[PDB]
Amino acid sequence: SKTRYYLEQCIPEMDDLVEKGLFTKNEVSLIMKKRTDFEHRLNSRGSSINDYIKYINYESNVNKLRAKRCKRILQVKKTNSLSDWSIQQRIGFIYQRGTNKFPQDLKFWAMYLNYMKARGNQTSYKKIHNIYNQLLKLHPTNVDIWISCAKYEYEVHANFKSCRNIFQNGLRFNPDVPKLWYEYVKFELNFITKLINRRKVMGLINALRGDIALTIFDVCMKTLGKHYINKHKGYYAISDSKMNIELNKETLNYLFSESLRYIKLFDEFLDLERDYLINHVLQFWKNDMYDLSLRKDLPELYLKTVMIDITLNIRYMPVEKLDIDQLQLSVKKYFAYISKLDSASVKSLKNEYRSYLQDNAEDDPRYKILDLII
Template identity: 60%
Template sequence: MSAKTRYYLEQCIPELDDLVDKKLFTKNEISKIMKKRTDFEHRLNSRGSSTNDYFKYIAYETNVDKLRKKRVERILQSKKTNSISDWSISQRITFIYQRGTNKFPQDLKLWAMYLHYLKTRGSETSYKKIHSVYNQLLKLHPSNIDVWISCAKYEYEVHANFKSCRTIFQNGLRFNGDSAKLWFEYVKFELNFVTKLLNRRKVMGLINEREQALDMQNDEKKNEKDDEGITLPTTGDVMKDKLNELPEADMNMLGSAETNPALRGDIALTVFDLAMETLGKYYINKHKGYYVGSDRDFEKQLNKDAVEFLFETSMDYIRLFDDFEDLDRIYLINHVIQYWRQEHFSINLETDLPEQSLDCVFLDLLLNIRYMTVENMDIDQLQLSVKKYMAYKNKLNPTDMKSLQQKYKEYIKEQFLSEMDKESNPGYRILEMIYNKL
């Protein structure tokens, strides 16, 4: 028996004695437990150990702890105890996970199970303990997007620590600026933050500026002690300046959505703009190879491919905006439309990518009626949409206009006419007249 194995087994003795004293296990059962632990420790300390050995050891200790808890309820009943055996097995499981991740730091499944175990223990696991595990994991796997997202979500979904979550996303993007998924999750977080803030104010009735300021100060004090928990890995100055230019949401949330652009989602839109610029640059650098400056036609085509990729990515953001009913979704989508009215990477949608340009026009046409239903139909907004349609009719070529007309009429028919009762709904005739004029 190695010295390390002997040392770990000796740590079990006080716990096992306590289990016997409480009459939760017999001496014969304790001997079997000790034998099992000896076998597992020999496997873990051997050169040929694998993660599977750690999984089996953890599964065994989990079963022992379940049996212990059942016997506590049955034998001790209402008697409250606070002795070493009440927490030692869970501490051992944590220690086994820790040893496993130290020996197999590249095994993400082991890390995931470790974090899941800590989180499911509730108040038995400290906030700082989970932070320390995330810190270790991020230092070892700074390019793993799912780890950054998991860490950030833990901050704002479990502890509502928005400041720390924002820091995690920004640090993650300094390592992984080319990750469309990470940018998307960051925008989603900012939208969630504003939504929760607005809903909270509705519930609490925060009306004036002073009440809002006091509420924000209380939140900052509440989270001050937690901010020290995350000490993330650092990198060079790539993207650092631009990320630092992002507005500090916590300091710009006074007022209402009408008086404060930040409460309409402008911070998320700022992140969207930065995401488009950064992802486009990464796309071009990744695909340009050895053709830098040597072929203008190739460079033009590469820029077109990059903008086409960005356009498809921006459609994902529009679908994301659809989910946030408490925000001004028309305002958010209009920002994306206006973004594509400008030239990016020397590419203009109207002249260089007509298909994407037509999709953008269709988005603009539906903007006023995108969230309109038969129940909340607004004829004025519908007529505004039709006016846009007529304006585009004079600008587009006949082929594009025919395609746009077909899509627009199909939308009107499917969303409204087919859902309305011709006899009982007075708006049906008006809508039918509008439809026939298209």
């Protein structure tokens, strides 16, 4: 039997752990009968990931007791013998066995990754790379594993090339969830922000732009639109032109709501050229979307983008020097909108007035602003 093999693999560490005079024979027999129970429950039939988890918790508890007893008996913090790594190696092998048997519970896979990362200097980052590789092989569609893999290899190791490779491979696998798109534009903005801040720092002590984020923004719009028109209206295109235009309108609503979220969490990256990097998404949304977002319905979205293009310089604090510089730009925007619109004219006028009043002695310059926007 293989429980016999594993149990007698456990004996040299307790040889060493009895020789180093911290445990006695009668208590190490007790930890062996508990470990016998656990090994038999592991490699018998009807096994459970809770059996694996309880074995890992028991082995961590006897490791903590071993460390406590070592500090109290020998008054060293490690005996530099077999019995201080064998038990963590055992926990790692219980994790490997469990993930080979039940490779379906991401709770257990993430407990494996957490213990392997928190093992510290003693583990190897290529050993973490191996279990990231096989986990991403088994779950390519689950996207938080791609985010966690790239987050470990950028926010700990700062490996930009491999992080870009992870994000491009994940976007190859599931180019359908917008969350991976948003985390990729987030990673690219974080990388370019660290690039220009190390430039600023080398200047203060002693070309490559957000156009990467704009290009992945562009392919984000194109492929998310393609995958929504392929996901809905699923089997066939058996739908008349009313249902086809209803579908295409709804995909425009979907994609434009995601770009609204993109600008909403795009504004807080204010260390690069945030005006240019928001204005390029503005000009990428301003063009035609093949179903007349401006010249027909989604006119509310056209008014939303017009309000964004108006306040895109007026994204400011109550110190309104930019307003005193270019509020005539907002007035010309309201005039150019009300020169064409019918109820969106009154809506945009009242909305820009309410927005400027809410956002903006100090009340006397604000009395000038109220007389301006009255």
